[PDB]
Amino acid sequence: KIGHDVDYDVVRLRLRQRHPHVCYEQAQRLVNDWDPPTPARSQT
Amino acid sequence: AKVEIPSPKDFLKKHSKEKTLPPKKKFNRCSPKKPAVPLRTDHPVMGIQSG
Amino acid sequence: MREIVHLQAGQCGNQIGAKFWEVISDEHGIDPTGTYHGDSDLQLERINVYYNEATGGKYVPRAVLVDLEPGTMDSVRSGPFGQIFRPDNFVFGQSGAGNNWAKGHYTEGAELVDSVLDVVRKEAESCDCLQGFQLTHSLGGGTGSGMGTLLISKIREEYPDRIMNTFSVVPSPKVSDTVVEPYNATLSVHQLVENTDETYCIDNEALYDICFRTLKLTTPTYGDLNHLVSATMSGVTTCLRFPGQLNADLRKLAVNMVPFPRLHFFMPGFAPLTSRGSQQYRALTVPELTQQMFDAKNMMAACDPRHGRYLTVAAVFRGRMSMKEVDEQMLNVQNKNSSYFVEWIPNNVKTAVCDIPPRGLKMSATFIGNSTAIQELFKRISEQFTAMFRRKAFLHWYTGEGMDEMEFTEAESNMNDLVSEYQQYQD
Amino acid sequence: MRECISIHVGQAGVQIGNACWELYCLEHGIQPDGQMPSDKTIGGGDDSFNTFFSETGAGKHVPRAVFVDLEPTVVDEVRTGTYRQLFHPEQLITGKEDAANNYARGHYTIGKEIVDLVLDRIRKLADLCTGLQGFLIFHSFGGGTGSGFASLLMERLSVDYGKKSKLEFAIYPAPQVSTAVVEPYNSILTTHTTLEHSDCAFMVDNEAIYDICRRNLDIERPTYTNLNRLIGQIVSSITASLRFDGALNVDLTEFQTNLVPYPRIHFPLATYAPVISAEKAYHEQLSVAEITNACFEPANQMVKCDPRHGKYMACCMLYRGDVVPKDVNAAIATIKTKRTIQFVDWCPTGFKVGINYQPPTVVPGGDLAKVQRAVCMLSNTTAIAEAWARLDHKFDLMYAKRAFVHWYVGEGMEEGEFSEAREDLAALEKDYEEVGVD
Ligand SMILES: Nc1nc2c(ncn2[C@@H]2O[C@H](COP(=O)(O)OP(=O)(O)OP(=O)(O)O)[C@@H](O)[C@H]2O)c(=O)[nH]1
Numbered sequence: 016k017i018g019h020d021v022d023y024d025v026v027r028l029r030l031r032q033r034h035p036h037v038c039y040e041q042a043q044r045l046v047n048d049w050d051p052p053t054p055a056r057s058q059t
Numbered sequence: 060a061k062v063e064i065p066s067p068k069d070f071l072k073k074h075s076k077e078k079t080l081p082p083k084k085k086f087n088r089c090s091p092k093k094p095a096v097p098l099r100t101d102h103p104v105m106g107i108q109s110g
Numbered sequence: 111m112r113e114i115v116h117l118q119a120g121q122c123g124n125q126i127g128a129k130f131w132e133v134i135s136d137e138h139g140i141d142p143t144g145t146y147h148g149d150s151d152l153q154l155e156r157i158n159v160y161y162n163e164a165t166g167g168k169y170v171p172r173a174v175l176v177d178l179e180p181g182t183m184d185s186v187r188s189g190p191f192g193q194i195f196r197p198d199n200f201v202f203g204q205s206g207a208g209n210n211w212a213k214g215h216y217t218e219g220a221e222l223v224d225s226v227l228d229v230v231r232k233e234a235e236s237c238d239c240l241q242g243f244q245l246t247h248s249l250g251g252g253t254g255s256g257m258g259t260l261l262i263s264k265i266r267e268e269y270p271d272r273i274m275n276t277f278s279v280v281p282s283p284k285v286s287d288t289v290v291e292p293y294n295a296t297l298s299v300h301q302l303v304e305n306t307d308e309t310y311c312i313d314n315e316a317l318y319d320i321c322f323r324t325l326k327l328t329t330p331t332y333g334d335l336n337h338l339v340s341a342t343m344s345g346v347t348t349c350l351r352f353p354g355q356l357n358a359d360l361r362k363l364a365v366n367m368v369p370f371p372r373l374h375f376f377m378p379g380f381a382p383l384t385s386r387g388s389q390q391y392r393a394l395t396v397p398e399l400t401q402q403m404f405d406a407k408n409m410m411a412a413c414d415p416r417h418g419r420y421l422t423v424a425a426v427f428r429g430r431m432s433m434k435e436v437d438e439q440m441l442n443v444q445n446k447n448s449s450y451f452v453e454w455i456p457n458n459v460k461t462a463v464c465d466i467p468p469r470g471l472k473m474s475a476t477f478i479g480n481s482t483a484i485q486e487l488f489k490r491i492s493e494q495f496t497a498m499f500r501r502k503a504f505l506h507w508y509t510g511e512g513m514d515e516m517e518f519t520e521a522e523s524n525m526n527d528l529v530s531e532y533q534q535y536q537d
Numbered sequence: 538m539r540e541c542i543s544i545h546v547g548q549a550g551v552q553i554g555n556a557c558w559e560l561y562c563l564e565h566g567i568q569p570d571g572q573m574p575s576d577k578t579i580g581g582g583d584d585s586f587n588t589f590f591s592e593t594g595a596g597k598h599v600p601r602a603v604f605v606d607l608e609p610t611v612v613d614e615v616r617t618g619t620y621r622q623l624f625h626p627e628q629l630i631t632g633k634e635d636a637a638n639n640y641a642r643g644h645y646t647i648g649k650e651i652v653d654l655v656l657d658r659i660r661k662l663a664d665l666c667t668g669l670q671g672f673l674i675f676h677s678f679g680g681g682t683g684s685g686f687a688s689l690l691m692e693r694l695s696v697d698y699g700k701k702s703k704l705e706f707a708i709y710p711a712p713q714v715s716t717a718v719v720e721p722y723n724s725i726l727t728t729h730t731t732l733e734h735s736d737c738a739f740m741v742d743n744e745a746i747y748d749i750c751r752r753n754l755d756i757e758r759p760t761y762t763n764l765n766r767l768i769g770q771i772v773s774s775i776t777a778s779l780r781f782d783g784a785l786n787v788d789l790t791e792f793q794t795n796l797v798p799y800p801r802i803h804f805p806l807a808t809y810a811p812v813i814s815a816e817k818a819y820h821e822q823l824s825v826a827e828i829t830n831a832c833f834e835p836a837n838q839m840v841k842c843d844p845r846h847g848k849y850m851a852c853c854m855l856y857r858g859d860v861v862p863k864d865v866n867a868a869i870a871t872i873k874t875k876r877t878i879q880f881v882d883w884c885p886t887g888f889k890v891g892i893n894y895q896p897p898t899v900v901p902g903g904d905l906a907k908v909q910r911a912v913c914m915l916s917n918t919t920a921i922a923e924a925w926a927r928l929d930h931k932f933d934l935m936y937a938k939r940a941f942v943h944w945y946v947g948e949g950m951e952e953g954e955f956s957e958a959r960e961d962l963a964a965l966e967k968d969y970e971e972v973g974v975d
């Protein structure tokens with residue numbers, strides 16, 4: 016299930032950087048840290 | 060008498076000068092004077108009868 | 111009896127020693143002049159673990175302090191406690207260094223190692239039976255590294271039975287001002303991995319994060335930073351000088367602690383840090399003590415143990431406690447995550463308890479751990495080295511010193527061994 | 538006459554002594570000063586204390602013990618406690634270094650330069666000793682420093698004295714609790730050393746002590762104080778036969794002769810019934826039948842093992858206080874015809890009964906109740922095999938990964954002794970299941 020989760024997150028994120036607005040700096044400011052990485056990795 | 064300055068020549072070689080030492084042996088312990096405890100489910104002699 | 115002789119190096123060490131000595135001094139209860147004040151006795155009987163006696167009830171430090179920058183010495187001299195030190199021991203140098211590693215290790219130390227060695231060996235003869243040495247220094251700092259690798263290489267052979275604890279400061283993962291700091295790190299660690307036995311590694315960023323999260327107090331002082339680390343030193347050395355069981359020898363811990371000769375580096379942790387007002391919003395109870403104790407934010411050395419797994423842990427506790435609460439707390443957390451541990455070995459906790467707390471707070475604890483989380487730091491630095499050495503810029507200074515790149519070659523694969531071995535065991 | 542000598546090694550062996558004498562002073566009423574009052578007993582040293590103390594002409598009772606440690610902290614502590622006048626200064630022998638929990642370190646690096654002093658002290662007590670039945674030895678299988686010294690000095694004194702019994706009272710490793718990772722190492726080392734030279738070795742575990750503490754004593758914050766208090770009461774019970782008089786008497790010689798069946802297997806268990814809280818005893822009743830039922834209740838034992846999964850070999854029960862053989866025999870017959878306890882087809886009886894009139898006493902400020910009929914339970918069972926069956930499959934793993942071995946090899950030992958301990962333990966189990974089998 017966790018793979019489904021992460022892959023759906025990926026497809027969700029990518030298709031939002033086509034909008035006519037938005038410019039260079041924000042992209043890089045989210046590249047390394049889109050969501051805090053921590054893919055819950057069996058959290059506790 | 061003086062300080063033997065190590066010149067900029069070298070250092071250890073790819074993780075050398077260590078303490079690893081597996082030696083091999085099977086040396087026995089002392090004498091367990093205490094004998095074998097069981098007789099392995101067997102018998103002494105008894106039950107001699109005579110009419 | 112059992113006694114320790116303290117070594118102080120580098121410009122970090124200048125203020126490190128100041129804060130650390132004043133902490134232990136006002137712990138045992140000595141006036142700034144040096145005359146005893148008897149309120150608790152056990153401290154008085156056990157003061158010989160560190161101090162040397164001076165006539166008229168005065169108690170001199172068994173410290174040996176060295177740098178090359180004289181202004182730091184002058185500031186320490188002027189501080190509100192520096193008078194306690196003894197002018198006999200201020201061995202120093204005759205110029206600056208520019209904290210170039212090659213200069214710091216090869217040219218300048220040649221004429222000072224003799225004096226420092228003679229002073230320390232006089233002290234060593236004077237004392238009775240040494241557990242070992244503790245050094246406060248830097249690994250990212252230049253002149254501390256240059257002198258310290260020399261001295262630690264020198265002393266091991268004469269005293270190969272003794273606990274050569276090294277306590278350092280690690281460069282920032284984000285920005286370090288000093289730029290050849292990488293090369294300092296690689297050259298220092300190359301000796302240190304072979305030579306030391308235990309090394310504590312801490313970094314400033316997490317101290318700042320701690321200041322924001324729990325101190326909350328806007329404008330700190332680097333003195334307050336040193337206080338937050340001097341607490342850790344006080345804790346880790348509590349147990350020797352005080353009664354109530356806990357087998358306290360740092361070697362008693364170390365054999366329990368490290369599984370393999372190339373595993374020396376550890377990641378510290380402190381106990382209750384209370385905010386502006388939470389003092390009366392916290393029920394000061396052992397369960398929540400341990401809750402905060404073992405946390406992702408209470409930790410402040412390098413990085414979250416989350417990314418990996420733990421081999422071993424050691425927790426020291428100071429206060430009027432009992433076995434049960436700590437023991438069952440450890441069982442509870444062991445169940446809570448019986449996964450991030452290593453089935454390699456069970457019950458990988460070491461516990462130690464002493465009854466006489468520090469003052470100000472009734473319960474206290476200190477954490478130290480060996481977990482699979484050093485790969486972050488050493489990876490980072492390894493790729494930094496490859497990138498910088500790619501066109502080997504700024505290496506002209508080292509060529510002039512006589513440094514040549516084969517030493518870089520010999521060191522880099524040692525760190526490769528470190529990374530591969532760390533990853534190899536746990537994975 | 539009927540006197541014995543006490544030895545303590547490792548820092549686990551010192552609180553327990555401290556408590557044992559904190560009690561043992563009281564039943565003859567000796568103040569920490571060390572003087573019986575003007576009541577007429579003082580002289581050469583003959584009266585019931587004689588088994589414990591040698592009160593000489595100065596009127597000062599003398600413990601017949603030795604406390605050897607390797608770190609001056611606790612020994613100097615007790616030398617600064619109340620009882621410093623009570624103890625003999627050099628009977629408290631201090632070393633300066635720790636064993637690092639490294640058995641071989643403690644057994645070869647440092648063991649060579651204190652054994653002389655300790656054995657000389659043993660001689661200069663054994664000279665004045667008269668009956669010299671034997672010794673009471675306190676160490677710990679998780680020996681922080683006790684293990685190696687215990688093994689070496691025990692071997693030396695075993696070869697030097699071959700005509701008396703030896704008693705060992707060891708705190709056994711906590712099965713799922715460890716404050717030490719070198720614990721399996723030094724534990725099995727000590728086992729395959731001692732099993733051939735201990736005459737009677739008894740185990741006790743401390744998790745179960747806590748479990749009892751918060752089951753029936755109703756206290757939720759106990760410590761070493763209560764732990765060692767009750768343990769000392771247990772050893773007091775087993776020495777009460779020597780201490781006081783009674784209808785008939787028992788002795789450790791009989792304990793050996795009848796309890797242990799065979800050579801080797803000499804690992805019994807102890808149990809105490811009337812550990813009850815003040816309110817709980819206040820408006821409830823105590824007598825022979827219920828105390829025996831509560832004692833054979835499986836969870837009241839102090840080792841995490843199931844006698845229902847085990848099979849029984851031997852049992853010696855000691856009643857202290859006032860009883861009558863009528864109820865004694867009636868109740869023991871009831872238990873004999875009880876159903877869950879699977880006695881082996883071997884033994885038709887299994888019960889050595891001892892009685893003494895003098896009831897056990899309280900400690901000032903303690904926790905136990907004001908009891909009139911106490912009882913102690915010693916037993917040979919086959920149920921203990923589970924502990925070793927658990928230990929072996931941890932040690933095999935941690936040794937096939939051979940972590941931490943660099944310490945021991947660099948200080949002198951090697952893997953051969955570990956390998957030998959393996960099969961020594963194997964022989965232990967192998968004997969146990971077959972003697973358990975009919
Ligand atoms: N004492 C002290 N050290 C500090 C302070 N702030 C940062 N440090 C760090 O402590 C480090 C160690 O200094 P030293 O051990 O004396 O190192 P060095 O050989 O003189 O080399 P450099 O650090 O390059 O000057 C420095 O590199 C700083 O990163 C501070 O306020 N006081």
Ligand SMILES: Nc1nc2c(ncn2[C@@H]2O[C@H](COP(=O)(O)OP(=O)(O)OP(=O)(O)O)[C@@H](O)[C@H]2O)c(=O)[nH]1
Nearest residue numbers: 355357547548549552553635677679680681682683
């Ligand atoms: N009966 C008793 N047991 C203790 C005491 N303190 C600790 N223990 C338990 O018994 C064990 C003590 O053994 P060690 O820690 O090796 O002590 P040691 O061998 O005398 O020497 P050290 O290495 O200095 O600790 C530990 O596992 C403790 O949990 C005590 O004061 N009395």
